Amino acid sequence: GKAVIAIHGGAGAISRAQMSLQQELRYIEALSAIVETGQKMLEAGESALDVVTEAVRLLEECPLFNAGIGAVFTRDETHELDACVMDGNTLKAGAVAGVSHLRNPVLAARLVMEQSPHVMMIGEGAENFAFARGMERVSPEIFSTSLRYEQLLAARKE
Amino acid sequence: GKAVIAIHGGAGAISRAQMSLQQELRYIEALSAIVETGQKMLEAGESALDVVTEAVRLLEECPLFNAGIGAVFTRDETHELDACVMDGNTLKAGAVAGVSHLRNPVLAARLVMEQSPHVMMIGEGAENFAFARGMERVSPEIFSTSLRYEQLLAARK
Amino acid sequence: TVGAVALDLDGNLAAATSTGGMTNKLPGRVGDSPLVGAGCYANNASVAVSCTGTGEVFIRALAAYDIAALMDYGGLSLAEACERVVMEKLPALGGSGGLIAIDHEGNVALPFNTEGMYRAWGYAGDTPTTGIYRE
Amino acid sequence: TVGAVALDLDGNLAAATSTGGMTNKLPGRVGDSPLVGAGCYANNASVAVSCTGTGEVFIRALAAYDIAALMDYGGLSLAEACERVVMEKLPALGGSGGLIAIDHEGNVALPFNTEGMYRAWGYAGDTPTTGIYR
Ligand SMILES: [Ca+2]
Ligand SMILES: [Ca+2]
Ligand SMILES: [Ca+2]
Ligand SMILES: [Cl-]
Ligand SMILES: [Cl-]
Ligand SMILES: [Cl-]
Ligand SMILES: [Cl-]
Ligand code: NA
Ligand code: NA
C-alpha cells in the first residue's frame, strides 16, 4: 500500500498583511523538516502511531506552534495544554486535557493509552499519573515565549 | 406530540441473588417517581431540555444512584463528578468534568451551555466559572454515603 | 452514572448524563459521561442518547453519536442501531453497558448487554414502566 | 493547535493532535483537541483525522468522527466527506478551521475554510509539499 503523512500547525486568520516574509519562511522550514522526518520514518517502515506521535512531539518542541513550547497563555497568564492520540489498528486512544507541568502532552496522552486502562485523564490527576509512570515534571514557565505573551497583551488591549 | 421520556440509573451486574426485594422496591420507587415527574412536565409542555435536566438533577439528588449525592469514591476517597447536557434543537451542549464542589453537575453543565461560549469546562476552572454565575460552593462531603464508602474499602481489600 | 432523554411536545430532543465515576478510580480519570458524542448526544434530525457502562469503550466507539450516525447516514432504525452498537460493536471492544435513546419519531429503546440497568420510561399521558433486570 | 495523521506501509492509520489552547482562554475550558471523535480520530476501516479550529463547533459536530461516519455509513469519498464537514456543516454551526485526513486507501486531504492553515503532506518515497495560505 501507499504510505503517507500529513501535519498541521493550526488553522485561522493567518494573513499576508500581518506576516513578514522571514516569519513565513520559518514556518515553511519547520513544516518542511517535520513532514520529512515523518516521510523518512514511514519509508523505513515505522508504525503510523510512532510517526504521528513523533511529528506531534516535534510540533510541540517547536516554539512557532501553539503546542508544547510556545503554548499560548490563558487569561490567567498560565498554560493549559491538551492532546490526544489514536491508533486506528486497535482503536485504542489516549488523551490528556488541562496539563501544565508536562513537557510533551502528546507523550502524556500516549502514556495514558499504553500505561493505564483509561482513555482520558485531566489536570493534576493526569500529571500525577504521568509522574508515577516516570514522565518528568517541568516548571510551568518552560512553555512561555515573548511572542505569545505579546499576543495576550494585545488581546487584552482590544 | 408523541412526547416521551426515558431515564437510567446505571447499567451493570445487578443480580437477583445478590439483592433483596426491599432493596428492589426502593429502586423501583425512586425510578418511578422521577420518570413520572418528567412525564408530567412533558404533558405540561415543558421543554425536553428542561425535562432531562430535572430528571438528572433528581437522580443526582437521590443517594441510590452514582451521580451527585451518593457518588462513588475515587482511589483517594474524594468525589470527582462529571456531567453533560445536549439540546437537539440548537446542537448546543454543556459539560463539566472533575468537579468536586458543585452540588448538581448537570446544572453546572447547563450553565456552561447557556451562560458561556463554551461546551466543556473542567476542575477548578469549571467551579470558578460556576461561582461567578451564582452557583454556591459545597463541601465534597455532602456526596458521601456509608454505602459507597464501604464499597471502596471492599474494593481495596 | 445516570441519565435521561426526552422528546417534547414541540418535537425537540435532548439528553443529559451525570456520574460520580468509578469506585476506586484513578483521580483525574474521565469516562464517556461528559463527552459529547460518547456518553451524551442529542440531534433533532435523529436521536437523543444517554449511556452508562465501561466508559473507555464508549469513548473509543463514540457510542452515542454512532447511534445517530448509523440512523442518519446508514438508514438503520433506532432498534437496529441500538443492536449494532450495544450488542455487537461495544462487546467486540470489551465494553459492557447500555444506553437509552429516543428518536425523532418518539420511538424509545433501552438496550444493555449487562445483567441489568436501572431504567424507566413513559409516554406523556401514559403509565410509566420501570426496570432493573432483563425482560 | 498542531496535528498529524499517517497511513503506514502495513496499512495502519493513526492520528494525533496537540494544543496550547486559546490566547486569553477561560481557565478550565476544553476544546476539541483532546476529545476522541472531535479533534482526533482514527480507524483502519476508514480514516485518520486531526482538527484545528473553533473548538466548540468541532465538539458539537463531532467533526473527526463525522468524516469517518460519512465515508463508512454514507459512502462518501474522503474528499466529499471533507467538503461536507469543513465547508458546509461547521460554518453552519458558526465554526471556522480545518482538518487533515488520510483514508485507508492513501488519499490525503487538508481542507480549511479560513484564510490559512499551517500544513504539509508527503507520500513515503516522495517530495513533500507545504502551505500556509489558500
Ligand atoms: Ca515505537
Ligand atoms: Ca491501556
Ligand atoms: Ca513526486
Ligand atoms: Cl525578507
Ligand atoms: Cl414482601
Ligand atoms: Cl458498523
Ligand atoms: Cl453484567
Ligand atoms: Na510548540
Ligand atoms: Na444520586
CATH class of chain C: Alpha Beta
The run of helices and strands of chain C is: EEEEEHHHEEEE
The strand order across the widest sheet of chain A is 2-3-4
Helix content, binned percent of chain A: 40-55%
Largest interface, counted with CB-CB under 8 A? A-D, 82 and 74 residues
User: What proportion of the residues of chain C form beta strands (DSSP E)?
Assistant: 25-35%
What sort of overall outline of chain A do the alpha carbons produce when their principal axes are compared?
Answer: flat
First-last Cα distance of chain C: 21 Å
Q: Find the CATH superfamily of chain C.
A: (Glycosyl)asparaginase
Bound ligands: calcium ion, chloride ion, sodium ion
Number of strands of chain C: 9
Strand order of the largest sheet of chain C: 4-5-6-7
| Rg of chain C, nearest Å | 14 Å
The number of distinct helices of chain C, counting runs of at least 4 residues, comes to: 3
Helix-strand makeup class of chain A = alpha+beta
PDB class: hydrolase
Keywords: Ntn hydrolase, asparaginase, autoproteolysis, hydrolase
Assembly: tetrameric
Entry title: Structure of Putative Asparaginase Encoded by Escherichia coli ybiK Gene
Structure characterization notes:
- The PDB classes it as hydrolase.
- The entry lists the keywords Ntn hydrolase, asparaginase, autoproteolysis, hydrolase.
- The assembly is tetrameric.
- Structure of Putative Asparaginase Encoded by Escherichia coli ybiK Gene.
- The complex is a heterotetramer, with 2 copies of chain A and 2 copies of chain C.
- Chain A contains 5 helices and 4 strands.
- Chain A is an alpha+beta fold and 158 residues long.
- Chain A has one domain (1-158).
- Chain A has a 3-stranded mixed beta sheet with strand order 2-3-4.
- In chain A, β3, α3 (105-115) and β4 (120-122) form a beta-alpha-beta unit.
- With 135 residues, chain C is α+β, with helices and mostly antiparallel strands.
- Chain C has a single domain (1-135), classed as Glutamine Phosphoribosylpyrophosphate, subunit 1, domain 1 (4-Layer Sandwich).
- Chain C is built from 3 helices and 9 strands.
- Chain C has helices spanning 55-60, 63-72, 78-92; strands at 2-7, 13-19, 29-30, 40-42, 47-53, 97-103, 108-109, 116-123, 129-133.
- In chain C, β8 and β9 form a beta hairpin.
- Chain C is globular and about 40 Å long.
- The chains are: A alpha+beta (158), C alpha+beta (135).
- Chains A and D meet through β1, α1, α2, β2 and β3 of A and β1, β2, β4, β5 and β6 of D.
- β4 of chain B pairs antiparallel with β3 (29-30) of chain D, so a sheet runs across the interface.
- The site of one sodium ion (NA) has 9 residues of chain A, from α2.
